[PDB]
């Protein structure tokens, strides 16, 4: 079972990504294609709500994992696809689907706009992915509406035996570059049920919260 | 889809060049970690030149075996050197290059056994080169007692003693003025040349020096100062120490210097 | 009332690129670069720095209408040299100069406080 | 579900042994003393139905999972060269 | 999102077998069995959506459809494994009773779908409807379930039904469906399409702006209808019957 972790640095500089790319250059084995990610928050527009019912809904869009959206609310996850190649053949065959769906963000922001309204949008484009010995590291700069926000690091490994050691090593590597205020997370949404992309989205939410 | 006769000739030249590159890269990988990331702004001075940078995980950091492949219309040669490269702010900087020990080898002669022998010897060669670089950072002049230098018997024989054709023993000649950082008051007592002998199998460091004049103080017992005088050469003495980490060897030298 | 919101001066709209580079069809090695949500403060500085490079031939900017915050820059350099590289060198030089200026001012202010 | 689709699937799958890509594997065990028996597994494949790909896995007699070498080859000349090199290395190991 | 161009009709089960043969004579394809299960969800009345812009009517509340395929092992009773799984089994599905009951469907709790009333005007020869669709692949969390998800969005369950029928694929992407519909409640199961089959022939268009394609689709549908003249009458349903907004309640069945 693969494991993943996410570390977000808030006080980063524009050139910190290059600094961390060069500081790891000795162990860098290869480089792969760039990636992107989107992060929306939707708000509840109804006022007759109970106290225990949350008001937000976080939508995370993964571009490299085959164009998939994940909706998060109160530690509850939902995974939607929008590509014609991800459709289970039964739904196509029986007639439950017309074959060319839409992203759930269009549905939230077009038809249900009287229940949910957008509040923010944080984007990340042209990230870099590096293959190290039994590890893959992805770096990207986060841009909000106002401007630069911070640095995002996501780590993924296939063997879970020595994940903590790798996390500690990367933390130390950030330490020599004097990035001392960083928030990390490797939590799991469900102890018994393990879905990789849902756990990744939950870790993103836990890292990016203010 | 090629368009020009010059384009076709260039395509065939590149075909020969990268076919040779692929063959030798496969030869290295079937035994070696190449780097496909490093791009140098200026080709290294030695007709097509290609630079390949290889290393091993257990090597010292930033030290790369650099191969310059020079391909001509009829013949091809390989220049094997040891260099130090770093990456700063998205740029590759050639921190150091060695030219006195360039191995110019014909294409045909390279074989698997030569590859593995080079693999074994290159660790010792790189250790010698990094010691040279460290002494240069200390601004200390030095010279390598290579295999030919040892075979020529120009070095003192007692230093050659115990070196039974072992690659784990390295001898370096140092200048007395350079090792003392310009102390000219000690030039009249000790010879201008000293010898640092390091045994990895014994993990021992010996600093041999030769007295320029025969002082009667040698007759006195200097056993309490950890100084052992050469039986063959009474004017020659040495300081022996045991080391565990090479990175701190500079301190050891100072200790020797202190003594 | 038809008065546009003020925050359109410093917040990019969605789908807006802060830079847009377009090759110029008249002179070789010439590019027109549009900057958004910016005014003379940046264009004057960048053009004055780009005029110091001996390989830069032409460097000029303009702000077509004082209602909109955007401006155009035009660069032309010598053969075998990229205008984007010239822009990068200019920005690096400006950043180094500003850093030196800040260090000098801090030293002088601390000396004055000691003398205060 | 429907009879027709399952019937066609069965009839098409019946021809897998003919339509599928041919493969071969050869395991060579060399008799060595000192409980150090290297293994040489060579699998031959034709991914595009015409080209020959030879994957060589040579495990020296050190550990059950410490694969000494694992390489791929598309030229029989390089296959022979690496086989000769492996034979020479084994002879040297037997001589030491 | 698609523009679906559709024509409707119905037949009595007496001619059913005959009809099937004729279809195979035209299409050149055999029928394929299928089934499905649809659940309809409506906005929660406990929550006051004042956001409906009453002075402008920017939007009106609507109903959401969630569909899923159910294996035939839930629809075949102990008397029916002997027969093979083909279309003839529909001949035994004439009773209001069905193996799938309320408790099993409650235990189950996909494709999410929303639609609008067809286009107005009397110069339309086929029912043109706009559909917005998405797919739910999986989920996780402490309350991973369709019911909990739709309550999180703000919707509640209204009813459900089960469709069983056969499909014919013809040229140009034309799909012809013969259906039987069973409404399901805790009180029991009732077949609304009693003693007959509901016939629906339709095509999908991916982009509504392309008008050459839409004209071609209408030409194909009218040619198909003119082929079946004298046997079955295919007609445009009532525009006010295919309206699924919450304010007004009716359900074409």
From Swiss-Prot, chain A:
| GO CC term, one of those recorded | core mediator complex
The alphabetized list of GO BP terms reads: cellular response to nutrient levels; negative regulation of ribosomal protein gene transcription by RNA polymerase II; positive regulation of transcription by RNA polymerase II; positive regulation of transcription elongation by RNA polymerase II; positive regulation of transcription initiation by RNA polymerase II; regulation of transcription by RNA polymerase II; RNA polymerase II preinitiation complex assembly
Q: Which InterPro entries match?
A: Med20, Mediator_Med20
Question: Where is it located?
Answer: Nucleus
Q: Does the keyword Transcription regulation apply?
A: yes
State the source organism's domain of life. Eukaryota
The reply to whether Transcription figures as a keyword in the UniProt entry is yes
List UniProt keywords, sorted A-Z.
Answer: Activator, Nucleus, Transcription, Transcription regulation
**Which Pfam families does its entry note?**
Med20
Q: Which GO terms describe its molecular function?
A: protein domain specific binding; TFIID-class transcription factor complex binding; transcription coactivator activity
Protein function: Component of the Mediator complex, a coactivator involved in the regulated transcription of nearly all RNA polymerase II-dependent genes. Mediator functions as a bridge to convey information from gene-specific regulatory proteins to the basal RNA polymerase II transcription machinery. The Mediator complex, having a compact conformation in its free form, is recruited to promoters by direct interactions with regulatory proteins and serves for the assembly of a functional preinitiation complex with RNA polymerase II and the general transcription factors.
UniProtKB/Swiss-Prot annotation, chain B:
Q: Does the keyword Transcription regulation apply?
A: yes
Q: Which family does it belong to?
A: Belongs to the Mediator complex subunit 14 family.
Q: What is this protein called?
A: Mediator of RNA polymerase II transcription subunit 14
Q: Mind listing the UniProt keywords for this protein, alphabetically?
A: Acetylation, Activator, Nucleus, Phosphoprotein, Transcription, Transcription regulation
The UniProt entry's GO CC annotations, sorted and at most eight, read: core mediator complex; mediator complex; nucleus
Misc remark: Present with 319 molecules/cell in log phase SD medium.
Taxonomically, which superkingdom?
Eukaryota
Q: Where in the cell is it found?
A: Nucleus
Query: Organism, per UniProt?
Result: Saccharomyces cerevisiae (strain ATCC 204508 / S288c)
Predominant localisation class: nucleus
GO terms assigned for molecular function: RNA polymerase II-specific DNA-binding transcription factor binding; TFIIB-class transcription factor binding; transcription coregulator activity
Coding gene? Answer: RGR1
**GO BP:** negative regulation of transcription by RNA polymerase II; positive regulation of transcription by RNA polymerase II; positive regulation of transcription elongation by RNA polymerase II; positive regulation of transcription initiation by RNA polymerase II; regulation of transcription by RNA polymerase II; RNA polymerase II preinitiation complex assembly
Q: List the disulfide bonds.
A: none
From Swiss-Prot, chain C:
On whether Transcription is a keyword of this UniProt record, the answer is yes
GO biological process annotation, one example:
transcription by RNA polymerase II
Chief subcellular location equals nucleus
Matching InterPro entries: RBP11 (IPR037685), RBP11-like (IPR036603), RBP11-like_dimer (IPR009025), RNA_pol_Rpb11_13-16kDa_CS (IPR008193), Rpo11-like (IPR022905)
Keyword Kinase included in the entry's annotation = no
Q: Which GO terms describe its cellular component?
A: nucleus; RNA polymerase II, core complex
Assembly and partners? Component of the RNA polymerase II (Pol II) complex consisting of 12 subunits.
Q: What else is known?
A: Present with 4280 molecules/cell in log phase SD medium.
Family under the similarity heading:
Belongs to the archaeal Rpo11/eukaryotic RPB11/RPC19 RNA polymerase subunit family.
| Name of the protein described by the UniProt record | DNA-directed RNA polymerase II subunit RPB11
> By which gene is this protein encoded?
RPB11
UniProtKB/Swiss-Prot annotation, chain E:
UniProt-annotated location(s): Nucleus
Q: Which InterPro entries match?
A: Mediator_Med18 (IPR019095)
**Entry's Pfam families?**
Med18
User: GO CC: one term?
Assistant: nucleus
What's in the keyword line of the UniProt record? Answer: Activator, Nucleus, Transcription, Transcription regulation
* GO MF term list: RNA polymerase II core promoter sequence-specific DNA binding; transcription coactivator activity; transcription coregulator activity
Q: Which GO terms describe its biological process?
A: cellular response to heat; positive regulation of transcription by RNA polymerase II; positive regulation of transcription elongation by RNA polymerase II; positive regulation of transcription initiation by RNA polymerase II; RNA polymerase II preinitiation complex assembly; termination of RNA polymerase II transcription; transcription open complex formation at RNA polymerase II promoter
- Gene3D superfamilies, sorted: Hypothetical Protein Pfu-838710-001
Explain what the record says happens when changing residue 22 to I. In SRB5-1; suppresses the phenotypic defects of an RNA polymerase II CTD truncation
**Mostly located where?**
nucleus
UniProt lists the family membership as follows: Belongs to the Mediator complex subunit 18 family.
One further remark on this entry is: Present with 1011 molecules/cell in log phase SD medium.
Task: Write the protein's name.
Answer: Mediator of RNA polymerase II transcription subunit 18
């Amino acid at each position: 079972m693969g494991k993943s972790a996410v570390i977000f640095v808030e006080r980063a500089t524009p050139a910190t990504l290059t600094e961390l790319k060069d500081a790891l250059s000795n162990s860098i084995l290869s480089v792969r294609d760039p990636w992107s990610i989107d992060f929306r928050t939707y708000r509840c527009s109804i006022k007759n709500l109970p106290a225990d019912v949350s008001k937000l809904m976080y939508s995370i869009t993964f571009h490299h994992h085959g164009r998939q959206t994940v909706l998060i609310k109160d530690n509850s996850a939902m995974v939607t696809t929008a590509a014609a190649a991800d459709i289970p053949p039964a739904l196509v065959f029986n007639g439950s689907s017309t074959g060319v769906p839409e992203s759930i963000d269009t549905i939230l922001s077009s038809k249900l706009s009287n229940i949910w309204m957008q509040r923010q949008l944080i984007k990340g484009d042209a990230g870099e992915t590096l293959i190290l010995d039994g590890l893959t590291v992805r770096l990207v700069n986060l841009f909000s509406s106002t401007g630069f926000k911070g640095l995002l690091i996501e780590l993924q490994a296939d063997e879970a035996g020595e994940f903590e050691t790798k996390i500690a090593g990367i933390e130390g590597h950030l330490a020599e570059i004097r990035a001392k205020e960083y928030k990390t997370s490797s939590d799991s949404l469900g102890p018994d049920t393990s879905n990789e992309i849902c756990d990744l989205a939950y870790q993103y939410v836990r890292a990016l919260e203010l | 889809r090629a368009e020009g006769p010059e384009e076709l000739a260039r395509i065939l030249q590149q075909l020969k060049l990268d076919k040779i590159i692929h063959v030798l890269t496969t030869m290295f990988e079937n035994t070696w970690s190449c780097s496909r990331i490093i791009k140098i702004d200026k080709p290294i001075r030695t007709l097509l030149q290609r630079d390949l940078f290889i290393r091993l995980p257990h090597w010292p950091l930033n030290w790369y075996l650099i191969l310059s492949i020079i391909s001509s219309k009829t013949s091809c040669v390989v220049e094997k050197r040891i260099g130090k490269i770093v990456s700063q702010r998205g740029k590759w900087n050639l921190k150091y290059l060695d030219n006195s020990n360039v191995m110019t080898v014909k294409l045909e002669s390279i074989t698997y056994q030569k590859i593995m022998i080079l693999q074994r010897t290159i660790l010792n060669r790189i250790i010698n080169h990094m010691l040279i670089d460290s002494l240069n950072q200390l601004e200390i002049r030095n010279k390598i007692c290579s295999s030919e230098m040892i075979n020529e018997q120009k070095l003192p024989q007692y230093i050659i003693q115990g070196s039974n054709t072992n690659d784990n023993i390295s001898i370096i000649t140092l200048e007395l003025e350079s090792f003392l950082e310009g102390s000219k008051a000690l030039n009249s007592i000790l010879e201008s040349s000293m010898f640092l002998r390091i045994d990895y199998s014994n993990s021992q460091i010996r600093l041999y020096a030769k007295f320029k004049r025969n002082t009667m103080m040698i007759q006195c017992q200097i056993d309490k100062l950890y100084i052992h005088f050469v039986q063959e050469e009474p004017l020659a003495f040495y300081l022996e120490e045991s080391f565990t980490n090479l990175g701190i060897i500079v301190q050891y030298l100072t200790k020797f210097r202190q003594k | 009332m038809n008065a546009p919101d003020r925050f359109e001066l410093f917040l990019l709209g969605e789908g807006e690129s802060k830079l847009k580079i377009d090759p110029d069809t008249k002179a070789p090695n010439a590019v027109v670069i549009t900057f958004e949500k910016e005014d003379h403060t940046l264009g004057n500085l960048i053009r004055a720095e780009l005029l110091n490079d001996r390989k830069v031939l032409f460097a000029a900017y303009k702000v077509e209408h004082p209602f909109f915050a955007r401006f155009k820059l035009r660069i032309q350099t010598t053969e075998g040299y990229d205008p984007k590289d010239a822009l990068k060198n200019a920005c690096n030089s400006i950043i180094n100069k500003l850093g030196a200026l800040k260090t000098n001012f801090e030293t002088e202010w601390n000396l004055q406080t000691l003398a205060a | 579900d429907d009879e027709n689709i399952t019937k066609l699937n069965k009839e098409i799958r019946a021809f897998d042994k003919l339509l599928n890509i041919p493969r071969r594997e050869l395991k060579i065990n060399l008799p060595l003393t000192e409980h150090k028996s290297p293994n040489l597994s060579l699998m031959l494949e034709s991914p595009n139905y015409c080209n020959a790909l030879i994957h060589i896995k040579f495990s020296a007699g050190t550990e059950a999972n410490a694969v000494s070498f694992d390489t791929t080859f598309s030229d029989f000349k390089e296959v022979e060269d690496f086989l000769h090199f492996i034979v020479a290395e084994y002879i040297q190991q037997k001589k030491v | 999102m698609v523009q679906q161009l559709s024509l409707f009709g119905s037949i009595g089960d007496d001619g059913y077998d005959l009809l099937i043969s004729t279809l195979t004579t035209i299409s050149g394809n055999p029928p394929l069995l299928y089934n499905s299960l649809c659940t309809v969800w409506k906005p929660n009345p406990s929550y006051d959506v004042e956001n409906v812009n009453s002075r402008n009517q920017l939007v009106e509340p609507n109903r959401i459809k969630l569909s899923k395929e159910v294996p035939f092992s839930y629809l075949i009773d102990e008397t029916m494994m002997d027969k093979p799984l083909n279309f003839r089994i529909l001949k035994s599905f004439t009773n209001d009773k069905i193996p799938l009951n309320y408790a099993m469907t409650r235990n189950i709790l996909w494709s999410l779908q929303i639609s609008d009333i067809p286009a107005a005007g009397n110069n339309r020869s086929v029912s043109m409807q706009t559909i917005a669709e998405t797919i739910i692949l999986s989920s996780a969390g402490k309350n991973s379930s369709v019911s909990s998800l739709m309550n999180g969005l703000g919707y509640v369950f209204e009813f459900q039904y089960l469709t069983i029928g056969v499909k014919f694929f013809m040229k140009h992407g034309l799909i012809l469906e013969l259906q039987k519909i069973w409404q399901i409640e805790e009180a029991g199961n009732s077949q609304i399409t009693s003693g007959g089959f509901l016939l629906k022939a339709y095509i999908n268009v991916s982009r509504g702006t392309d008008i050459d394609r839409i004209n071609y689709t209408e030409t194909a549908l009218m040619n198909l209808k003119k082929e079946l003249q004298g046997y079955i009458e295919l007609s445009v349903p009532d525009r006010q019957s295919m309206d699924s907004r919450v304010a007004h309640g009716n359900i074409l069945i």
